[PDB]
Amino acid sequence: CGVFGIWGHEEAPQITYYGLHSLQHRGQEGAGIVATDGEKLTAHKGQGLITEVFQNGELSKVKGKGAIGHVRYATAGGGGYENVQPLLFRSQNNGSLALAHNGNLVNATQLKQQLENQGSIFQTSSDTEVLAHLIKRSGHFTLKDQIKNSLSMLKGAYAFLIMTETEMIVALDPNGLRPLSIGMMGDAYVVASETCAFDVVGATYLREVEPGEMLIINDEGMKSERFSMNINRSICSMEYIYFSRPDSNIDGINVHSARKNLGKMLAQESAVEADVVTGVPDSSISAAIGYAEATGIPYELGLIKNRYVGRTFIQPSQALREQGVRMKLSAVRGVVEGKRVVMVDDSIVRGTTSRRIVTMLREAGATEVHVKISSPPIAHPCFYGIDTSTHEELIASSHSVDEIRQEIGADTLSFLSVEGLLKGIGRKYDDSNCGQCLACFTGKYPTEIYQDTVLPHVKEAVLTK
Amino acid sequence: CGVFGIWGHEEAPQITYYGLHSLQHRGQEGAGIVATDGEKLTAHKGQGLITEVFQNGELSKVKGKGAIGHVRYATAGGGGYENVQPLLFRSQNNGSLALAHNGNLVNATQLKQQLENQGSIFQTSSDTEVLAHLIKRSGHFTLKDQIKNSLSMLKGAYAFLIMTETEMIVALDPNGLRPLSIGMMGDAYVVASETCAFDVVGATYLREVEPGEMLIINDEGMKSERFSMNINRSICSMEYIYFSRPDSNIDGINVHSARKNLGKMLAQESAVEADVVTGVPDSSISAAIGYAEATGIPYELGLIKNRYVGRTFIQPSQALREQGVRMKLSAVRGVVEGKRVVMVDDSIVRGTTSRRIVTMLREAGATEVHVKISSPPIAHPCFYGIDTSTHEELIASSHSVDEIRQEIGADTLSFLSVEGLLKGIGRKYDDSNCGQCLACFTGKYPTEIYQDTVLPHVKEAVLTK
Amino acid sequence: CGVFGIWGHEEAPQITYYGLHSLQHRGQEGAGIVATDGEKLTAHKGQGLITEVFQNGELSKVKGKGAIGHVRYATAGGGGYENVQPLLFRSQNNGSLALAHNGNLVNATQLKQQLENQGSIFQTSSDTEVLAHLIKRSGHFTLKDQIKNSLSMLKGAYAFLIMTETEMIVALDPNGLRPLSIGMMGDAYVVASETCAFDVVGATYLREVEPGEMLIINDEGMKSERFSMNINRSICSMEYIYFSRPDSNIDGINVHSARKNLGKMLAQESAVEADVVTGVPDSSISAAIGYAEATGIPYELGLIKNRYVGRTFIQPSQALREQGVRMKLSAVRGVVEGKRVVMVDDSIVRGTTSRRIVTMLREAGATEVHVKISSPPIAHPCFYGIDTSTHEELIASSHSVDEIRQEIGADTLSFLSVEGLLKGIGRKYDDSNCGQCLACFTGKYPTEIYQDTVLPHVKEAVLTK
Amino acid sequence: CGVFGIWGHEEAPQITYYGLHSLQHRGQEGAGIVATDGEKLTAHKGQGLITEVFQNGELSKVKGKGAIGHVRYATAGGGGYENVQPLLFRSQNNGSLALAHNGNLVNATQLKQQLENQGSIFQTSSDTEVLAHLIKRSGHFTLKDQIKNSLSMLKGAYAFLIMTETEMIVALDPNGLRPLSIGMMGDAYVVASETCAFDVVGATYLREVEPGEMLIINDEGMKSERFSMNINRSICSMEYIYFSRPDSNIDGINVHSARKNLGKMLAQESAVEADVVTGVPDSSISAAIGYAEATGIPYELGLIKNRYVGRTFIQPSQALREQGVRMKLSAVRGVVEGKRVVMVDDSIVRGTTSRRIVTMLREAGATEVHVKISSPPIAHPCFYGIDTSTHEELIASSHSVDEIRQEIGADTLSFLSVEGLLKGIGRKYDDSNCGQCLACFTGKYPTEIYQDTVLPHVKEAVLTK
Ligand SMILES: Nc1ncnc2c1ncn2[C@@H]1O[C@H](COP(=O)(O)O)[C@@H](O)[C@H]1O
Ligand SMILES: Nc1ncnc2c1ncn2[C@@H]1O[C@H](COP(=O)(O)O)[C@@H](O)[C@H]1O
Ligand SMILES: Nc1ncnc2c1ncn2[C@@H]1O[C@H](COP(=O)(O)O)[C@@H](O)[C@H]1O
Ligand SMILES: Nc1ncnc2c1ncn2[C@@H]1O[C@H](COP(=O)(O)O)[C@@H](O)[C@H]1O
Ligand SMILES: Nc1ncnc2c1ncn2[C@@H]1O[C@H](COP(=O)(O)O)[C@@H](O)[C@H]1O
Ligand SMILES: Nc1ncnc2c1ncn2[C@@H]1O[C@H](COP(=O)(O)O)[C@@H](O)[C@H]1O
Ligand SMILES: Nc1ncnc2c1ncn2[C@@H]1O[C@H](COP(=O)(O)O)[C@@H](O)[C@H]1O
Ligand code: SF4
Ligand code: SF4
Ligand code: SF4
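Predict the joint structure of the above. Result:
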């Protein structure tokens, strides 16, 4: 998922639409904007793409000088309109409250159970809602402090944008697992999960949001505060490996560049003698470019991705698929035929895509296919976001690198060492891990996981199918 | 536009749908499929993306073992449902005829005049409709010979696919201006505008359709006949430079490879000392890869394209635009800032896009923007297809290269030479031009152009706006 | 089907949309409007309801001071876009021609076979296309003389509106089988299939178009000419019995009042003793009111029709249907229980509805159900329009009135006599038939019916299902 | 709004689609269905007509043997997805609950105000949500007993349907202001606001739900407990006068017959010499027939309503409107010209429709237009339902019958008397009001209205516009 907010722009919902649109790769399962004019909160949301939701007719109904928005992921595409964020709570003779979140709370099961016994009913299956109930039951005398202390009760990954009629409150968890960055646009402040949305919108980037920090932004300006001084910096490593758009800079490290270095690191860890380097369209293009350059083997387009495959694309029958019919990716014979191909891919999670890709690449006539992954094996469950998790198996859970080389049928398979990865991304944070979360790879989480903690996706509500 | 056909496959409308979707880049303004079962022709078509047109519920209406499909381009996005192809003409006690075209008949106004005078009424503004009036009024004695001699009355560019209940006729013009290839998929014969459609569907390439050749495909098999032994091979150079999918091989020369060599010719004709090579997303990635390798300047992703802009995407206002809001493309500050960039693009037609890209590139921090273009200047009009024409002004009609350079705002501008273009593509054909059409660049059209000849867009029917 | 036209009103497409909207009852399978400003005809059409076709965004494109529109009936709901009208032909350096028909040409096959022999290809199975081809192939010097002379070659029913950039030509066949009337709305002349359209649009009625008359309406005024002086007036009796909207007046006789008089005839021809009178929702309300008024038995609402059934209404399964789920109509038990019902309907065609209704009336507790039908039996086919014919078996062909009574399960069954039908409508014309077509009742057609005359629906194009 | 539920049928969501369809006239702003198989609740809901909401694909996703459904009214067509019911609240490790309401809680502001002071956040502005919070916070031990005591706190009109995975609880307020009737369909119990739903679906009437009664339906069967003894019968008089479909029986009295009697009362209290009785298409058809019969003046269709006006219908401009273009209703000249017309309407609420109708009738040539109303003046507000209130000015709050006669332009104007009304409907309930709510007419409410009580509409959520 991804979040965007702007306080102090008279066209703030139109800007949130473009901002949210740069973050459209972070989830296509729902989108929504809530805006305040200082008097009242107006909103629109729905399932699907920002263009699908705001066909238009709808961007006209959201007016305000400040707005927050959210782009949402859902594993099983559907989940319900219920969970499309921002969530909005109204209280007459007390105010409106809107909230958006990118992350996953590890103790939300537990908290919902306690809340229901204090007499709470839940309508969504969102972690945002759990926060709404906690602010409301807080005994502190100020919204800033009720939020400030409700965050004390939450465990896990979270980027929250909260907005009422009169101020935007931004908070980043003490590990800083999810990205949140502040930029400026005139005299408006803007907060976004990735800096590429500032590029798109015309906003000058100011700085990241510290782990454990909470910003109150309103007509007086931006106020900072720190709800936790006990911090442990460990950003999601996959943000740099696969999830962020290439033109974002996570902590000042540009994602294209970092990814290119993982191709470079991979080359120096594992060269092969071969004739062509191909990446995989869109996920490993940058790393393939870096690997090819470090190695001197020419960089080629040996896989092409169809640009118009969507939810409306009819998938081929198993029969057509065994007859030869491709769906989103096909190997290109005019480049790979009679060549020894190295296929750089950013990661193997289930094993499925690399297998299909080694086969396509063999049918096109590659005589050797070597697979190079700019990641360590992903062995463990991510408990920090629907987007960063999978409900399907991790073959590294059960297989070795020779058993995975064997399942996908590579002539050879390589992963980056944890050491090469950290070396490659290049953070300057003194500790073992340079301030990054490596738990999917290594098993060691920067967070206490509970016995009750469910895998993020498990929190679903609408069936869809 | 692009056509696709298959005779003898028990799943022919489905195969035609996957075939047309790999040709979707060839036109997004309408799509259609006409299929036959030996008995009656059933058909579905409409305006829009293939997936918009067969949402589904609809491919299940169109059934048969033979099928032809067309993907259409219209400059004024609209044109009218009437112009969406295939065109189906019906006659009880004499048969159905379905026709799809890719090319532009340069003598169609003249032929329509002579036809309305012999009593003809025209429902569309399609050339396809001109061809069907000529078949009906032909006094030759067999369908094959009527098409064969109506083809002789046509001037310009054409790849025609014709289908009745019982056969499929394919014809390629005497210059071979627009492409066509034949493949086989088990026992079925398939025809496509580019070979990438064979790759996707799982069909074996056999050969191209010869300039001046016509194939009669049916249940007996495939028959060839030459309707003109007076041929002058001149294929569209822009097919190679820009229009084809990268994985397609035109006349056995792979399109990615060719473009990459065009980058290597540009590097030796005009190599500059700079820090970064960047292509423009999607249109000049391969030429920029080749330029970069040729030159030893590292290839970066200095520009990004938003994957979700579209006909529903709300375009930003003029105000928002001068506030700095981006639409489909942005430069990536993390790669170009403080750097000297070479921006390699395949072609400059109107000069709008590179003026925008050099600006954005300066705004993001490039100390130098050097623009290298893998084409000669396009100074003359194309009369051989809507898809290969523009209705806006070619500035190299008016501007010298330094006048274009000043206008787009580049530090330098360099185009490929015609000697370097023919050298880069590598066609082995004994003549000045290696079998290509260089008219937009040189002024020498390979067909006669009349004083009555309209430029492709001029033929429109619906307003749309 | 229904046609509407207005010349000389600057808001003419909008007026045509409301005018056609009041004739929507004549056709639910397509709607289209063509308008002219003096230079160009602009048009929009599609399948479905007017409201469906013109969501809006669309009615903004059809701009002009003259417009013609058509509402279409297609039996097997579909036909295909191609048969949706008005048909628009364009011809550079010679003019566009839009045409809309309501009727059926009994010798269309013969004429089409001839035109194909002179080199014509047809794209639609529209009679309008036949007329378009006859006009062009006429030798005459002026559109008026070419039309005048083409109409001579037409046999069957026809109300035609033709339109060009500069004039409208209206023409009605020598029998006046189908109604047309003229109105004036300020200075604009309006033309419509029924007068309710004029009530709805604020136009004043003028007069009926004469059988054999063609009118040329343009900015000079309207001119009447006679293209056939050999007329034998035979209006569709079913226009009066069932098809027209109750507030329309055919030859100055009001449709509700005529139908109510047919209700008073049936009471003097067949008065029975019962308790409650009920018509059927919507088709036989006025007649039911007449039979009750005549009789002194109270008129009740003993059947209800659901206002929200339509194409998007899911039909009950066979299972659910015999469990007792009703679809459009249900008997109101609270009116009919233990009561002797006379149920008045306008006509029995297939036998189905009357069987369904008498079953429900008995299920709701009725003690006797006496069907009274205000029509003679319909025993012969209609060759004068899809809207007035059926593809299904008519039971009065095979069954005597007692066998039809046994089939529908009524206690008694009475049909209006032809003499009562003629006395009931009250047309003042001197001849046997009071100027009415009664072919479907008596077997005798007001027109020559060929061995090549197909039933109108047998002229279909698209499968749809 | 209307509610329908069925317990114990394998095809229960389908039965509810049809049930909800017969009640579609009670509200057109949303539709929802929640089914239970014994293990889990599945739902689907959305704004628009049932046929719009369940296009299908959707109805098949709901599965179970028990289901509840609601059809919603929203004054301003809008309110937002949140207010569309049945509301569903989930709790893992405590069960799901679904609720549908038809009524208005006159004390809900007070109740929300209390709930919020106990830690409750609210997401929708529905009263169903208020009850939800109140059941969860109830100290009692069994769900039955929780509901029993929450209902005791509610002030106003309410017909609740509650459903969990295993039982359906039905409850009607102590005045029975809104109808609920129980029927039986095999062994499945079925509950609906109007009995037409039973007809339409094949359910056999059983008995009405008593006021202050609650029923617990589950696989054991049906249980009944009186949550209140202190009851004061006052059914809505407007259910009889206008709101119910004409085949429903409210309290064993048929709505068309009761309406026809109100027509006969108005006749004996205000008779006139005129030549035509006309009703207004659909609301006053039954009363108009009663008046004509009692008066001996002929009943005619003097006004037609257009069957195809909709949300999607493009409203005429002011200029088109004053040019004479009609919207949903037109007057018929063939019936009323040169005639004295009595127009019987069911009620006058803002005075707009009847001014509009009397003008049209005069423009059609009527000499006299005498308006008779089968209601008293509606001079007071309704605080018991959005469907039975208007947010607009009631003109009998400010105007006398003669000021109203002048405003609407009537030749003469009459309203029924409260006595004539109680007498026409025919309840023999001993008490002054025959067991009816007459507040809108007399100012006497059957309930305590609070100083905090707002008019139903004022509780609006989404802006829409
Ligand atoms: N506009 C874009 N340009 C290039 N890569 C993109 C873009 N948006 C997202 N990405 C990358 O696309 C990859 C995911 O796409 P895919 O794996 O092809 O579905 C991610 O690794 C992203 O970093
Ligand atoms: N958590 C994730 N969710 C979705 N896509 C992922 C995830 N992690 C990585 N990806 C993409 O999935 C690929 C591996 O696919 P598979 O092996 O089929 O699971 C990687 O190359 C990524 O492009
Ligand atoms: N699926 C695809 N993968 C990669 N490039 C493509 C694809 N389809 C078309 N192209 C190229 O994209 C360019 C057009 O994209 P653009 O000019 O960015 O809109 C052309 O130069 C095509 O050769
Ligand atoms: N005939 C053409 N029609 C459409 N796009 C074109 C054409 N020729 C080249 N292109 C694209 O136009 C670009 C030049 O854009 P401009 O200079 O704004 O006309 C190239 O990079 C191609 O992507
Ligand atoms: N707006 C309308 N009001 C009343 N009756 C109508 C209307 N439009 C069409 N009709 C009549 O309704 C009958 C067809 O409707 P139905 O029988 O309900 O399908 C015909 O007899 C028409 O004359
Ligand atoms: N030609 C026709 N086609 C369609 N509806 C018709 C036609 N003639 C009469 N109707 C209607 O069909 C009824 C007879 O229906 P059925 O006997 O089931 O065919 C009458 O009440 C009319 O509403
Ligand atoms: N509560 C109400 N809300 C909506 N329509 C109503 C209401 N009460 C009566 N009606 C209709 O409104 C008509 C009166 O219209 P008007 O006087 O313009 O409000 C009556 O014939 C009813 O059909
Ligand atoms: S003139 Fe240019 S774009 Fe046109 S056919 Fe020739 S090479 Fe192609
Ligand atoms: S045969 Fe019947 S339906 Fe046909 S035109 Fe004559 S009266 Fe009308
Ligand atoms: S005030 Fe009137 S409309 Fe409201 S509940 Fe009472 S009778 Fe009904």
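The CA atoms of residues 106 and 453 of chain B lie 6 Å apart.
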